[PDB]
Design a protein around this nucleic acid. Sequence first.
RNA 1: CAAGCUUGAGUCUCGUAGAGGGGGGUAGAAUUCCAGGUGUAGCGGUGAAAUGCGUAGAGAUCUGGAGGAAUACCGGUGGCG
Length: 76
Amino acid sequence: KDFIINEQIRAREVRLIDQNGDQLGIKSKQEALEIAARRNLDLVLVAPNAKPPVCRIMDYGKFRFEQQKKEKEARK
RNA sequence: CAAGCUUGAGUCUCGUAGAGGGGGGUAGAAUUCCAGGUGUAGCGGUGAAAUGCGUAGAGAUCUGGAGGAAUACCGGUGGCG
C-alpha cells in the first residue's frame, strides 16, 4: 500500500515510468525528481526491490485517496 | 349607619434612563457550499493514531456568488421585566 516518494527515495538510479505508461528508461534520482516536478506530480517508488528500483510519476494523494475509497466502499 | 378628613391609593402635566414586549426593514465579520485564477502534494485529526479528504488538483492563497444562523468590540457584582 504505502509507498515512499520524492526525497524519501534513497536509490542512486531508478527505472522511470511516466504517468501515461511511457518507459523513460534508467535515470538518476535527481533527473527523475526534476521530471516529476516539471509535471507537478510525485515520484513514487512502486517497485523498491526491482533492479534498478522502479519509480512511477503520478499524483500520490489522488492515488492514495482512490485506494482508500475503494477499500471502504467495498466493505460497507 | 350617616356625614366627613388627606397622610394611604389613584388621576393629571412635563421630562429621564433602560437587552421590557410585538411587527417590519437593514448591516458587517465568520463558517459551509457553488463558480473561477495562482499553485502542487499533501490536508485533517490525536496523547499517539486511524477512519475521513486530495493529482476528477485538495489544503493554502486571491476573486465573484448563494444560503442559514448568531450578533465581536461597546460590556461592566451594568440595565429592564
